[PDB]
UniProtKB/Swiss-Prot annotation, chain B:
A GO biological-process term: regulation of DNA-templated transcription
The family this protein is said to belong to: Belongs to the TrpR family.
One GO CC term, this protein: cytoplasm
Organism: Escherichia coli (strain K12)
DNA-binding region: 61-84
Protein name: Trp operon repressor
Gene: trpR
Subunit note: Homodimer.
Subcellular location(s) per record: Cytoplasm
Matching Pfam families: Trp_repressor (PF01371)
Length: 101, 98
């Protein structure tokens, strides 16, 4: 069939298993070495940069040019980061505005 | 540049701190949806199984490719990362994943 809900739930349960693994690593102070095992150095740098992208999209002061030349974020990335922010639950957006700004 | 190096490090730690706080506030699921693409999340769920089967040591390289779609470079990245990990992590992962 064209869409498999069974495989979607199996993928979801594999993802939850990672989420739970990392939850427990934070509890036991093994989060930093776990993250180094599970993410490449480039993936880690990308995540650090994405935090600044979300912060700037939320602040809404940086120009497209400044976003591109300070964070490598082109019109594709900005759009994707915007759609993600639009899709996020308000409780997350509010919490992020508090914490990040 | 040790300055830039230290800048990139603080940016990474800020993410680690942000996610730690999201877990404390039960916002981790939506935070991770915002910060990772669907393909990145799938890759992470598959990487947990790769790590589990590497540690179990039962599946051959061929079987890892067959079952998990993990090719030689991916398996080698997993093996290299287990060798680079602190022993306490390896020992914990054996407890929790097996």
């Amino acid at each position: 069939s064209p869409y498999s809900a069974a495989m979607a739930e199996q993928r979801h349960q594999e993802w939850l298993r990672f989420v739970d693994l990392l939850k427990n690593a934070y509890q036991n102070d093994l989060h930093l070495p776990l993250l180094n095992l599970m993410l490449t150095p480039d993936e880690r740098e990308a995540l650090g940069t994405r935090v600044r992208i979300v912060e700037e999209l939320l602040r809404g002061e940086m120009s497209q040019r400044e976003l591109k030349n300070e964070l490598g974020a082109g019109i594709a990335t900005i759009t994707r980061g915007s759609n993600s922010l639009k899709a996020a639950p308000v409780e997350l957006r509010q919490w992020l505005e508090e914490v990040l700004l």
